[PDB]
Amino acid sequence: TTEIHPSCVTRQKVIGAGEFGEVYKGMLKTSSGKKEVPVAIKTLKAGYTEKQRVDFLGEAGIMGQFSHHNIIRLEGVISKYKPMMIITEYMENGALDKFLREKDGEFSVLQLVGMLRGIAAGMKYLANMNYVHRDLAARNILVNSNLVCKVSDFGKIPIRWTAPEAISYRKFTSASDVWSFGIVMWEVMTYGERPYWELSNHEVMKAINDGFRLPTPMDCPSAIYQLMMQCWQQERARRPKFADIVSILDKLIRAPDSLKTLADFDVSIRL
Ligand SMILES: Cc1cccc(Cl)c1NC(=O)c1cnc(Nc2cccc(C(=O)N[C@H]3CC[C@H](C(=O)O)CC3)c2)s1
């Protein structure tokens, strides 16, 4: 993890604030002063506890182990000066869930499937690097100006994205992340609809344990709905691996007529 000198960082705008720190958009001077890049900068405010420091610096330590197109890139940290900072690449379109809700209906099927392929490729890499995300959801994916989606937020757990064995037994593995990816597929194809709508957490658990699953999104390719349904097998060993998901999505994208067979969606009487 690269320690960045504070003279190389400038903050221009607040992105968001918390009771523990803020996130800024800024610039980072790199490469011996010959290069300047936009960055996101997260701070940890004075008075933080040892646990907070371990978690904050731990998120950057995890992020710095990875080098993949679909995983947010860490530029480095400021730990020797206060406030401490984590510095990442800047993703111009922010969080995927909010982005899709602000772009409802505006992308093609192929674009949405390509976003899911990118997220799956980042998750395949994390899983094979022996990392279980445990909080995979479209709110934790960021989107750049070129529509590339990257897994972030490597730092309670929303029930409605979590596989049943992780809810009950706290058995979190890459297969429970596959369940969560299935919910992200449904979020993407619905432009950010809230999984399970008004059901309470216990009602979501009730429905899932009775075998209910989220219904097809509108205008969703049958193959895409079949794949998200497989992600939601109750028996975790029956779920696809991320390697299978990436392979299937690639085959669909390469033969895009395969995406024209739509799953049935389901009163206005008129004619
Ligand atoms: C993911 C992560 C973990 C730990 C540390 C850090 Cl620094 C990160 N990185 C980040 O949080 C972010 C990387 N890129 C981000 N982009 C982002 C997220 C949410 C909203 C926006 C967004 O649209 N911000 C605008 C709001 C309006 C202004 C403008 O540019 O017109 C200023 C910036 C951008 S946040």
Could you say which DSSP state residue 147 is in?
Answer: -
Ligand 1: residue of 1, 12, 44, 91 to mutate (most ligand atoms within 8 A of CB) is: 91
The CA 142 to ligand 1 mean position distance, Å, reads 8
Domains contained in the chain, number: 2
For CA atoms 152, 156, 161, 165, the dihedral sign is positive
Q: Burial letters for 94-106: b for 16+ Cβ neighbours within 10 Å, e otherwise?
A: ebbbebbbeeeee
CA distances 93 to 66, 102, 136, 163, 264, Å, are 22, 10, 18, 28, 32
Q: Which of 57, 91, 125 is the last residue of a domain?
A: 91
Q: Which residues pair with 89 in a beta bridge?
A: 39
Q: Are 30 and 106 in contact (CB under 8 A)?
A: no
30: part of which helix (H) or strand (E)?
Answer: strand 22-30
Q: Is 114 annotated as a binding residue?
A: no
Which residue type does 137 have? Answer: A
Q: Which of 33, 60, 91 is the last residue of a domain?
A: 91
Same domain, 159 and 196: yes
Same domain, 150 and 268: yes
Q: Residue 244 has which token pair? A: 């299978």
Q: Whose CA is nearest to atom 30 of ligand 1?
A: 92
CATH of the domain at 141: 1.10.510.10
Our answer on whether the CB atom of 40 is closer than 6 Å to any ligand 1 atom is yes
Could you say which DSSP state residue 77 is in?
Answer: E
Experimental approach: X-ray
Same domain, 108 and 229: yes
Our answer on whether the CB atom of 152 is closer than 6 Å to any ligand 1 atom is yes
Q: Is 16 annotated as a binding residue?
A: yes
The CA 23 to ligand 1 mean position distance, Å, reads 7
Tell me how far apart the alpha carbons of residues 178 and 237 are, in angstroms, rounded to a whole number: 11
Our answer on whether the CB atom of 133 is closer than 6 Å to any ligand 1 atom is no
Q: Is 241 annotated as a binding residue?
A: no
The CA 205 to ligand 1 mean position distance, Å, reads 33
Same domain, 193 and 87: no
Q: Whose CA is nearest to atom 34 of ligand 1?
A: 94
The CA 63 to ligand 1 mean position distance, Å, reads 16
Q: Residue 22 has which token pair? A: 């803020």
Tell me how far apart the alpha carbons of residues 85 and 35 are, in angstroms, rounded to a whole number: 20
Atom of ligand 1 minimally distant from the CA of 87: 7
Tell me how far apart the alpha carbons of residues 97 and 44 are, in angstroms, rounded to a whole number: 25
Resolution (A): 1.4
Q: Domain containing 97: what range?
A: 92-271
For CA atoms 80, 67, 253, 265, the dihedral sign is negative
Same domain, 196 and 145: yes
Same domain, 78 and 198: no
Report the catalytic residues: 135
What strands, in cross-sheet order, belong to the sheet with 84-89?
9-17, 22-30, 35-44, 84-89, 74-78
Tell me how far apart the alpha carbons of residues 222 and 227 are, in angstroms, rounded to a whole number: 9
Q: Which of 74, 91, 108 is the last residue of a domain?
A: 91
Burial zone of 122 (CB within 10 Å; 0-12 exposed, 13-18 middle, 19+ buried): buried
For CA atoms 148, 151, 157, 163, the dihedral sign is positive
CA distances 250 to 61, 121, 188, 244, 245, Å, are 31, 10, 17, 10, 9
Q: Which residues pair with 27 in a beta bridge?
A: 10, 38
Among all chains, which residue has been given the structure tokens 């049958």?
Answer: 222
Q: Are 57 and 77 in contact (CB under 8 A)?
A: yes
Per DSSP bridges, beta strands 141-143 and 149-151 are: antiparallel
Same domain, 75 and 100: no
